[PDB]
Amino acid sequence: AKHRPSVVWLHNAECTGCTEAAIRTIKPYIDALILDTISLDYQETIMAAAGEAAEAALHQALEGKDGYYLVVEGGLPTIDGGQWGMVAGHPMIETTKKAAAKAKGIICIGTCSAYGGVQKAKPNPSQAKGVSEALGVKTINIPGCPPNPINFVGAVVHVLTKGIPDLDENGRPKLFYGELVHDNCPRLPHFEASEFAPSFDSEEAKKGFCLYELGCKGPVTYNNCPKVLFNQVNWPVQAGHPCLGCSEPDFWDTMTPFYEQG
């Protein structure tokens, strides 16, 4: 028996869409990943244990002699001593703090953990923060709402076997986030020729004209969506819908209104 690296996965202020994204991996599939590559030692969505049993699985993982890597999904609600987001009677901020302290590395899966995400959007009633900000620690950011499993699993494999990947100014691996959505968009020749859909009902839309006038944020968003696709079949612009900018920090406020450019 070859020992497999321990992974602890925490869920904070999140919609579980990042967990769902992750399990869409096909290189390898999730079963192979967790049976052959890593030891996924805590994961509320799929783990067998509950309550005190689950809390004890976490503690055992955190005290493991070989150490562990930390995955964090979701932002940290900080209002009222972190009490608006709790697990096992403890503020999310407290548990994430304790787990980060000894982690070999921290991967933030999704725009929520990376940057604060949907709950952080104005007026931010829960005082939600991204992990790096709330804890004061360096994170490897895998953003998108949710990120492609290709990006998350690729980063995880890379960190286990090669080291910390080259990151851009926002903490994102250049391997996946180095290029604009816009630069790999098949509608680009339409954009260049100023061939735009004015509405979704228009003949221009039916003809697959560029979606810039309908609010597309591809020109200001770093992600690999048109190059790798999602689910082996599609991406939003191919489905005739503008990019929302969902891999950019605070996109909820910087990219809105979604159907405009102002």
């Binding site: 869409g17 769902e20 399990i23 509950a50 055992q60 979604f258």
Partner: protein, 544 residues
């Protein structure tokens, strides 16, 4: 005889695992039976607050992030909501496409729930390692359709992989499992454990395919991106090659449903027949789904192929029409400000106010939705009772089939066993309808590819969007003022099922269902999980 201890005292389970989100369950137990219960949601985000003052067109993209498990459904409810507010009727192709994406969501969501969320409450994975792979193959060849995945060779390979994993000492997601070392509440023969475990792993591959199918129409999964005000954006989704690949993927997923999910479900239900007397509630609500006329909320309610309705006091003889004006939410026992009780969602108020953990006066981030004073169970069991009661042909045939196979009366469906069976029943029915629904849209889209209607933003207006999501009756409600969001309220299936007590102090469905739960082992209270998991909890949904 259902195992049960003599335990008297409190039991808290936090976290409730294998659900979406953050749930604490507290119960009082006497003589090994639950005598009181509290359902305590542990996270608040405040999407309704965030939406205030924003572009109504933006709502769907925020609200979709209520949940990534029931991804899509909130984007659809918001789109329906805003369509209704601007008074636009969507083109026929858009209704069809939006409904197929919902169908694809049901298939993905239910399959993952049964295997990856629920099964570990009933299946002892480590006992699968005690099985003879050959006896197990023999058993599978007699309780299920013939298939290579069920061969002695395939089952031995599963067992070998599990054996190597367990003997490694790193149990991963099975660390501290309630079934480790055996458990009195786990009844299945080792052979059934092995069959179910093999399918659990196959299901991990099959859900990828279910999501690919969904993404052909939805642009991606999780979090679709094809709906717009006035219809849909995905012209390519009406064309021949993608629809043929959509059909093929759906057929593979439905073969797995028919070959694995339903037979596993029925085998489990067969061994846990006592759970047909545990965890029942009395009132059921559905807004219906899969409508032939989605021009208005009233039309949706009327023409949903999975029908809408209201059953009270378990009376299948009296299905009432849905009164959308009778819906309101209480906050008495919730972490919100004083004076917010009895609000219709158009007048909804979200003023968060936390107190302390396990304050019996305020113990959940969920509001308490009520219908004329009454709590309402929503979801597959609600849809099943309503469709059955109305004599919906597919539901009548499948329900009676299940009742015939299990040898139980229809009254045994008001239970945790019933709740679990119902989820499988509607999955088979969605599967039986896919080819007809795809043909309808292919045929229609090929004659004319109109997918989005023209519309204008009104200065002041209101609208409601209804959907029956996988977990049940979902509604989004908007007040528009100055062309902006003045109020946007979500009332979500899990809010109905798992919220706290209403203003009368009356327990919610889940809290009521928990009363009388037997606890064989207070150290490892799997019976609480069984009932809670049966409702398919989604806490990010219920609280938003």
């Amino acid at each position: 005889p259902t195992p049960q201890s003599t335990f008297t005292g409190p039991i808290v389970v936090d976290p409730i695992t294998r659900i979406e989100g953050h749930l604490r369950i507290m119960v009082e137990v006497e003589n090994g039976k639950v005598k009181d219960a509290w359902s305590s949601s542990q996270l608040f985000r405040g999407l309704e607050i965030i939406l205030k003052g924003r572009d109504p067109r933006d709502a769907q993209h925020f609200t979709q992030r209520a949940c990534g498990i029931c991804t899509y459904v909130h984007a659809l409810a918001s789109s329906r909501c805003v369509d209704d507010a601007v008074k636009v009727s969507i083109p026929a192709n858009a209704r069809m496409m939006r409904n197929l994406v919902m169908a694809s969501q049901y298939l993905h969501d239910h399959l993952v729930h049964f295997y990856h969320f629920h099964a570990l409450d009933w299946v002892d994975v480590t006992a699968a390692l005690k099985a003879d792979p050959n006896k197990a193959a023999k058993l599978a060849a007699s309780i299920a359709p013939a298939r290579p995945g069920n061969s002695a060779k395939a089952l031995k390979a599963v067992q070998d992989k599990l054996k190597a994993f367990v003997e490694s000492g790193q149990l991963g997601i099975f660390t501290n499992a309630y079934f480790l070392g055996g458990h009195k509440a786990y009844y299945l023969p080792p052979e059934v454990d092995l069959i179910a475990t093999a399918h659990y792993l196959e299901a991990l591959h099959m859900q990828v395919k279910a999501a690919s199918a969904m993404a052909i129409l939805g642009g991606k999964n999780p979090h679709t991106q094809f709906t717009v005000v006035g219809g849909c954006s995905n012209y390519q989704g009406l064309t021949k090659d993608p629809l043929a690949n959509y059909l093929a993927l759906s057929k593979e997923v439905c073969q797995f449903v028919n070959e694995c999910y339903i037979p596993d479900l029925l085998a489990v239900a067969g061994f846990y027949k006592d759970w047909g007397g545990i965890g029942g509630t009395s009132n059921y609500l559905a807004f219906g789904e899969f409508a032939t006329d989605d021009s208005s909320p009233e039309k949706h309610l009327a023409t949903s192929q999975f029908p809408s309705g209201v059953i009270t006091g378990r009376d299948l003889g009296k299905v009432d029409n849905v009164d959308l004006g009778a819906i309101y939410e209480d906050v008495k026992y919730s972490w919100y400000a004083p004076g917010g009780d009895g609000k219709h969602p158009y007048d909804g108020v979200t003023d968060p106010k936390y107190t302390k953990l396990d304050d019996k006066d305020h113990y959940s981030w969920m509001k308490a939705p009520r219908y004329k004073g009454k709590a309402m169970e929503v979801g597959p069991l609600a849809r099943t009772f309503i469709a059955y009661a109305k004599g919906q042909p597919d539901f009548k045939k499948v329900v009676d089939m299940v009742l015939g196979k299990l040898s139980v009366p229809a009254t045994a469906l008001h239970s945790t066993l019933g709740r679990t069976a119902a989820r499988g029943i509607e999955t088979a029915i969605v599967c039986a309808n896919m080819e007809k629904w795809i043909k309808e849209m292919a045929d229609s889209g090929a004659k004319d590819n109109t997918l989005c209607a023209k519309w204008e933003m009104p200065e002041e207006s209101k609208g409601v969007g209804l959907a029956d999501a996988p977990r049940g009756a979902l509604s989004h409600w908007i007040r528009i003022k100055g062309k902006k969001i003045d109020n946007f309220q979500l009332v979500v299936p899990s809010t109905w099922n798992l919220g706290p007590r209403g203003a009368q102090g009356d327990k919610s469905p889940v809290e009521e269902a928990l009363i009388g739960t037997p606890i064989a082992d207070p150290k490892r209270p799997v019976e609480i999980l069984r009932t809670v998991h049966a409702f398919d909890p989604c806490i990010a949904c219920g609280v938003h």
